[PDB]
């Protein structure tokens, strides 16, 4: 595929989630909470009430939604699944990624854990389920980096949930097949095919002995299965909308459920008549984590589509009006950029976030210019309108709630801008070439010594990402880390030729031309796109001081002499033919 260069405009430290939280893990030994965010960052929090700042560390190596995390090996290792089609092994005590598994071909959505055998399974949208041994993964080294893969098979649609029992002898898969498939992880052999759900299944549970299964589906029903009888022994219709999260206690007698309807319930399994409404969240519930320190669980952690993670006490469930009204503990969250507009100069972007704040950003310098507050976004677009046209040279995606700018070979160098039009003091400048040199400034291969493009510098903490167009992430690094030994070898392998030509070979991109034929108002010419009208005025003057005696017009409209033909063709021409300019005496 074609390699793209992308980077994120962000702060050095992002303490709070900038998007929703997909998964939760609780460490009882250190009293630590792990949040798998939709902003591609895993964060560690302290659940102690004494600390007024629960933030501990950020675990930032993914490039897309983190869908599931499991805490294994007594809280020393974290396994994460993500939409970037990778499974990653982490040091949960320190907070750095150790290795990346690239066996999946689509989004990885579910992780299953067997505590006794230390066995972890990863399943995703590619209909593949892979089995991993954590100790084998944790003992991997640079020299010894080979692993034998054992994959389950027989699933005809994309998996959305996965489950294992404590002993690691039963694994259940939920998918859009509307059926549940069960295997034996030891022998990698099929056992049964549970049926009865009429929609996608997103939540799965199993007991310690692995003979009973709890499933919740988008149809709004919770079904209790018996693996010995291979049948559904009970069906619970508790929620108005789909069920997305499930939690059960150690006795496997009470199930905690939540989903799209934003309501969380505690349902008694032996008789569904005892139903307690724990709370009503402000957003659809994506995942829930129980506090298993005491029996019954004192509290439950809830992750929603909002950036805030809340804890709800369970004091009095066994002792409709909700049980709780305000969460006991709150972990703050940031704001997600939801709307984006690129201004006419193709250098500044106005963004609006979930708090309705409007901000002004500089793509070239990869920094925020100013905050505007709760200003009308559409009015601000008109207020900053300019009479200029610059070709598109970058793309913007807001999947992680942050500004990610993508540079592709097709249009990276399509924007030529004179230095006077920009804020740099006129030599002729290519925005795409300047940005690439600033991103790879610390790379020794680009030094011939001068550093960078000599006009601006992106923040050193800017994450630079190399990846295939609609594919995998080849290499990810910070801007300031390009000078390292290990990063330089990786950069040589991953940086494509079209970036090498400009950053290493120091070549200059093409100069595009528009052909225009002058006609007297009542001879084809081609010139640079940034050529001003004044130059065409003086060319006619020699054909027949130049500005004062000659006026140019297009489509029966007078032309600004300081304006360029690139702006003329885009705005005033309003036609599919070659640009036509008419010269008439003033």
């Amino acid at each position: 595929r074609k390699v793209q260069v992308s980077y994120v405009i962000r702060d050095e430290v992002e303490k709070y989630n900038r998007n929703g939280v997909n998964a939760l893990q609780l460490d009882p030994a250190l009293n630590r909470l792990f949040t798998a965010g939709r902003d591609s960052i895993i964060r560690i929090w302290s659940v102690n009430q004494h600390k007024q700042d629960p933030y501990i560390a950020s675990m930032e190596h993914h490039t897309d939604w983190v869908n599931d995390i499991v805490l294994c090996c007594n809280g020393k290792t974290l396994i994460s699944a993500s939409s970037d089609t990778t499974v990653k092994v982490w040091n949960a005590h320190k907070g750095f990624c150790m290795s990346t598994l690239r066996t999946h071909k689509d989004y990885v959505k579910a992780l299953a854990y067997a505590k006794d055998k230390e066995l972890v399974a990863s399943a995703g949208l590619d209909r593949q389920i892979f089995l991993w041994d954590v100790n084998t993964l944790t003992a991997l080294t640079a020299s010894n980096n080979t692993v034998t893969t054992s994959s389950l098979s027989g699933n005809k649609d994309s998996i959305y949930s996965l489950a294992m029992n404590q002993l690691g002898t039963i694994i259940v898969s939920g998918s859009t097949e509307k059926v549940l498939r069960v295997w034996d992880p030891r022998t990698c052999a099929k056992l049964m095919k549970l049926k009865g759900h009429t929609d996608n299944v997103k939540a799965l549970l199993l007991n310690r002995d692995g003979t009973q299964c709890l499933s919740g589906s988008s149809d709004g029903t919770i079904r209790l299965w018996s693996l010995g009888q291979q049948r559904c022994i009970a069906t619970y219709r508790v929620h108005d909308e789909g069920v997305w999260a499930l939690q059960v206690n150690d006795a496997f007698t009470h199930v905690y459920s939540g989903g799209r309807d934003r309501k969380i319930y505690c349902t008694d399994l032996r008789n569904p008549d005892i139903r307690v409404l724990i709370c009503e969240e402000k957003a659809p519930v994506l995942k829930m984590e129980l506090d298993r320190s005491a029996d019954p669980p004192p509290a439950i952690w809830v992750a929603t589509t909002k950036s805030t993670v809340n804890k709800w006490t369970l004091k009095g469930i066994h002792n409709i009006t909700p049980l709780c009204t305000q969460p006991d503990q709150v972990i703050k969250g940031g704001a997600s950029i939801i709307q984006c507009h690129i201004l006419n100069d193709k250098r500044h972007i106005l963004t609006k976030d979930t708090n309705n704040n409007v901000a002004y950003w500089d793509v070239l310098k990869a920094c925020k210019v100013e905050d505007l507050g709760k200003v009308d976004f559409e009015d601000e677009i008109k207020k900053r309108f300019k009479m200029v046209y610059v070709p598109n040279w970058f793309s913007v995606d807001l999947k992680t709630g942050m500004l990610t700018i993508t540079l592709d070979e097709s249009d990276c160098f399509a924007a030529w801008v004179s230095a006077k039009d920009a804020g740099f003091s006129d030599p002729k400048l290519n925005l795409g070439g300047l940005l690439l040199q600033a991103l790879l400034e610390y790379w020794p291969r680009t030094h011939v010594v001068q550093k960078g493009n000599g006009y601006f510098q992106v923040p050193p903490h800017t994450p630079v990402i190399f990846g295939e167009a609609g594919g995998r992430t080849l290499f990810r690094l910070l801007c300031r880390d390009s000078g390292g030994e290990t990063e330089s070898m990786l950069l040589n392998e991953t940086v494509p030729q079209w970036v090498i030509d400009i950053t290493v070979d120091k070549n200059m991109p093409k100069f595009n031309k528009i052909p225009f034929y002058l006609q007297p108002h009542a001879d084809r010419l081609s010139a640079s796109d940034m050529l001003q009208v004044r130059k065409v005025m003086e060319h006619v003057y020699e054909k027949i001081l130049a500005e004062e005696k000659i006026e140019l017009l297009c489509q029966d409209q007078v032309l600004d002499p300081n304006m360029d033909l690139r702006t003329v063709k885009h705005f005033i021409w309003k036609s599919g033919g070659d640009l036509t300019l008419h010269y008439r005496q003033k």
Binding site: S99, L137, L140, M489, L490, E493, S526
Partner: protein
């Protein structure tokens, strides 16, 4: 039929007025109409129209990027021309006769002005039809070769340059066809690649002058075509690399230097190689074990730019090399040693960062320097295990350890300990035992062959130790003490301790052992001479040790030479440093110690001769044998330093061969070598000797001009022929640097003409070289036909007349032409120059004949043939010797009459006759034709199977001339009939001969 032609011609005129975007629909319809009628007219109109568009677009595009008058944009012009080409090619698929007309219309020897970027691109896509693939690619191959012959002929002759206006060449056209192919010309790329490989395959070097340069230019064009097609087009770069590796990865040992250079240029774009064509490199790696050692070393150096940036390729190579080393099969461990050396000589960081169900895991671990050291030490220890193998492997390691230790300073201890351990196996630690080296352990008997190159081991030790004491200091003392002990015991050895003249025979076992042991002793003495020079600086005691070592080296060299070679072990840097101190050192302290070395004339000869060997190695191989001998920048620096000393010694003090004469030989070799290899550095080369290239060259030229005058001022018996020949060779090479349109060139020509006109030497070789220099300068200045005519008169005066009743007046235009050198030296030389004149005129007539400026060309052609008539007029009545002078003159007269026939046949095509042409015809009939018959009579009258061939071969030349004259008179009858002017009144009746036996 005629109706179709008329309507086609009408549509051809409409081409200009209508829009370009409507052309492809018109061409497709016009091609269908062509099927039932005229075919050549349709193709000619389309090709001619688009060629004018290409030419007009090129002129208007050339200029600044400001407001330009652009009738057609480049982007849409290439798009239109592309779809026209596809329509023509598709039409040829359904109409075979259309394809034949295209090849016939574009068939080439003539310039074929029809060829253009559009027509060349049309032909390349036609190759997609296999029915036309071979003949079209053969058409293109002949076009470029003929085009390069045109360029070579024009450059060497000033007469043609004033006449022929510059025209574009097929090589330039094809290069921009590749450039224009970026606009989605995917149908041209397939034939573009095949044409590039045909040029390389057919005209690649065959090392295993007239045609070598166009062949080299044709081969270089194929490399340019392939390289530029590689960069632009992604779907073809995989095929290019596979075909390049096919030609390179072989055991055939065919000359593949041009393919290796193309491979090196391709792998400079490593991301392009790794992206698509990545498996081919790894497959070539798998075959490295089977390849011979020389192929592996050159192939790995070619792909070195790829391994410098890529870890995966480097990691795959290490795995292949490790597997090859562990293989029991031999000739693969040698390649593994060569591969591991090259990796360790070039890269400081080595190392990284499967079954059916086994996958690799991206472990994010930081680079570990300590682990890298163990990785390198593991390979270094493996290489130490290869020092007990054959002497071929030992020779490679000794050459590689110096660069390994310079690259990885962290391997210095491992390398030095390895060298110390090997030296202990052949060094006698006893302070009084002689000799200090066990030369019998270096000999393996099983036939006698060399096991350990002891001389090369000390060369590596001495150079590695020298680097150690000046790179890492700011075992070494043990090594410093061993070398001093070796030096003392080699000096006090009486050559009897080495068991050396006893047999010294080239067949007996003891003689072979004695011969090899003689080489090792001389090799050791050279290394110890190099060691003692640097150590203790400029001390008299150490230089006396050097002189004692040299006598041991020279005495053994004399014994081997007279009873009867090998390269010297001195580094080129040391030879440059030794020469500078030995000839151009005046520091007071150094003079006392240097007087010991300077007092030995044999040492003076030895130092200069080794410098000549280094220059000779550069010319033969392109690199020098010693350390830093493959670094062009450092070789050039030593070339400048050696040249300065050789210039000084020769010029400051004038004169086996003398020292000054040897410096002259080295100067000639350096000047040839510098121009052959360091062409862009000539200004820097001339600057370093003590304005522009012409001004500095003229200063050196005048400096050697004065030298030649001194020898010519001497007596005939005292004439130093060897030195004079060298001076003309130096002057010839230096004069290649002067710009012909400069006063410096005019002075050089005026000086050479004056020397020839005034100096009369009896050396035939000196006269031949001097005239060759004079003609080389003159031809680039003006036509030498007047010069040729005057030289022919001198030959006529000295050799007399064939009439034997007339006396020819001695003109004495040139004193260099005397009775001894007039034949066969000057006569054969002037005949070869008149041959080149006729080739130039034949080229002009061929161009004019195919062209239909004519009047200026016709007058110049007649003026050349008119003057060359008088040159031949003097030679046909000269009493030449019966050897090759008569054979060459008869062959040249046949060429003269063939050229006259070609001129007459040209007027047959044109004259539906000017005075100058008539006078040329009259002159040929009154001054050449009757005298040719007299010369034929003169030659014939006066006087196993090999003799049978000789007598039958001598019956060819005279009948060949008779046919040439009769063919010439045949076409003059045609011209007289056509032009209604009787040209046969100037020609007498032909004279025939009959045999009668006495």
């Amino acid at each position: 039929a005629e109706e179709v032609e008329f309507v086609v011609e009408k549509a051809l005129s409409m081409f200009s007025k209508m829009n370009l975007q409507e052309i492809p629909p018109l061409v497709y319809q016009l091609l269908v109409l062509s099927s039932k009628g005229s075919r050549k007219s349709v193709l000619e109109g389309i090709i001619a129209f688009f060629s004018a568009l290409d030419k007009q677009h090129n002129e208007e595009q050339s200029g600044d990027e400001l407001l330009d008058v652009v009738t057609v944009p480049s982007g849409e012009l290439r798009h239109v021309e592309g779809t026209i080409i596809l329509h023509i090619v598709f039409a040829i698929k359904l109409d075979y006769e259309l394809g034949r007309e295209l090849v016939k219309h574009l068939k080439v020897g003539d310039s074929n002005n029809n060829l253009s970027p559009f027509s060349i691109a049309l032909l390349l896509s036609v190759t997609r039809i296999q029915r036309f693939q071979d003949q079209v690619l053969d058409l293109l191959k002949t076009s470029v070769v003929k085009s390069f012959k045109d360029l070579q002929l024009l450059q060497g002759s000033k007469f043609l340059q004033n006449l022929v206006p510059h025209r574009s060449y097929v090589s330039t056209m094809i290069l921009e066809v590749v450039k224009n192919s970026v606009h989605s010309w995917d149908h041209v790329t397939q034939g573009l690649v095949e044409l590039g490989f045909i040029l390389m395959d057919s005209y690649g070097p065959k090392k295993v002058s007239l045609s070598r340069m166009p062949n080299q230019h044709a081969c270089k064009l194929g490399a340019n075509i392939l390289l530029e097609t590689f960069k632009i087009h992604e779907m073809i770069r995989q095929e290019i690399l596979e075909q390049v590796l096919n030609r390179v990865v072989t055991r055939a040992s065919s000359p593949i230097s041009h393919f290796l250079d193309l491979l090196s240029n391709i792998v400079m774009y490593a991301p392009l190689v790794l992206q698509s064509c990545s498996s081919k490199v790894t497959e070539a790696f798998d075959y490295l074990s089977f390849l011979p050692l020389q192929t592996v070393q050159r192939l790995l150096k070619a792909v070195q730019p790829l391994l410098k940036v890529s870890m995966s390729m480097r990691d795959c190579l290490i795995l292949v090399l490790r597997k090859a080393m562990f293989a029991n099969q031999l000739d693969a461990r040698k390649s593994a040693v060569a591969g591991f050396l090259l990796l360790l000589k070039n890269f400081k960081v080595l190392g990284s960062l499967l079954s059916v169900s086994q996958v690799h895991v991206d472990v994010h671990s930081h680079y570990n320097s300590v682990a890298n050291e163990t990785f390198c030490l593991e390979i270094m220890d493996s290489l130490r295990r290869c020092l007990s193998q054959q002497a071929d492997v030992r020779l490679m390691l000794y050459e590689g350890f110096y660069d390994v230790l310079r690259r990885n300073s962290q391997l210095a201890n491992s390398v030095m300990q390895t060298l110390l351990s090997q030296l202990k196996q052949f060094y006698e630690p006893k302070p009084d035992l002689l000799p200090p080296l066990k030369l019998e352990a270096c000999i393996l008997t099983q036939k006698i062959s060399l096991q350990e190159p002891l001389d090369y081991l000390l060369c590596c030790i001495q150079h590695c130790l020298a680097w150690y004491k000046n790179t890492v200091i700011p075992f070494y003392e043990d090594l410093d003490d061993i070398l001093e002990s070796i030096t003392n015991r080699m000096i006090k050895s009486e050559l009897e301790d080495f068991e050396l003249s006893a047999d010294f025979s080239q067949s007996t076992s003891i003689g072979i052992k004695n011969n090899i042991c003689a080489f090792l002793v001389m090799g050791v003495c050279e290394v110890l001479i190099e060691y003692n020079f640097s150590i203790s600086s400029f001390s008299k005691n150490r230089f006396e040790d050097i002189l004692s070592l040299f006598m041991c080296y020279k005495k053994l060299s004399d014994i081997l030479n007279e009873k009867a070679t090998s390269d010297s072990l001195l580094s080129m840097k040391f030879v440059s440093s030794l020469l500078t101190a030995l000839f151009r050192d005046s520091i007071q302290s150094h003079q006392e110690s240097l007087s010991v070395l300077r007092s030995s004339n044999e040492f003076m000869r030895y130092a200069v001769n080794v410098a000549l060997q280094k220059v000779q190695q550069l010319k033969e191989t392109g690199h020098v044998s010693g350390p830093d001998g493959q670094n062009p920048e450092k070789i050039f620096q030593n070339l400048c330093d050696i040249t300065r000393v050789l210039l000084w010694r020769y010029t400051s003090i004038p004169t086996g061969k003398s020292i000054s004469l040897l410096c002259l030989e080295g100067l000639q070799k350096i000047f040839s070598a510098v121009q052959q290899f360091y062409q862009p550095k000539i200004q820097q080369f001339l600057r370093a000797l003590d304005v522009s290239v012409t001004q500095r060259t003229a200063f050196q030229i005048r400096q050697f001009q004065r030298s030649l005058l001194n020898l010519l001022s001497s007596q005939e018996e005292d004439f130093n022929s060897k030195e004079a020949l060298l001076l003309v060779t130096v002057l010839t090479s230096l004069s290649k640097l002067l710009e012909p349109s400069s006063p410096q060139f005019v002075q050089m020509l005026s000086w050479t003409s004056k020397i020839c006109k005034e100096n009369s030497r009896e050396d035939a070789l000196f006269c031949k070289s001097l005239m060759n220099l004079l003609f080389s300068l003159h031809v680039s200045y003006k036509s030498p036909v007047i010069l040729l005519r005057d030289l022919s008169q001198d030959i006529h005066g000295h050799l007399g007349d064939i009439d034997q009743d007339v006396e020819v007046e001695k003109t004495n235009h040139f004193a260099i032409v005397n009775l001894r050198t007039a034949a066969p030296t000057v006569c054969l030389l002037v005949l070869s120059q008149a041959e080149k004149v006729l080739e130039e005129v034949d080229w002009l007539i061929t161009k004019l004949k195919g062209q239909v400026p004519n009047q200026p060309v016709e007058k110049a052609i007649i003026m050349q043939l008119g003057t060359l008539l008088t040159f031949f007029h003097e030679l046909v009545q000269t009493a030449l010797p019966s050897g090759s002078c008569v054979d060459t003159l008869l062959k040249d007269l046949c060429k003269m009459y063939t050229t006259l026939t070609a001129l007459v046949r040209y007027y047959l095509q044109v004259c539906q006759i000017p005075k100058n042409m008539e006078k040329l015809v009259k002159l040929s009939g009154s001054h050449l034709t009757p005298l040719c018959y007299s010369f034929i009579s003169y030659v014939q009258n006066k006087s196993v199977a090999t003799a049978m061939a000789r007598v039958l071969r001598e019956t060819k030349p005279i009948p060949n001339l008779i046919f040439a004259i009769e063919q010439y008179e045949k076409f003059l009858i045609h011209l007289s009939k056509k032009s209604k002017v009787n040209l046969m009144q100037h020609m007498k009746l032909s004279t025939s001969r009959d045999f009668k036996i006495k």
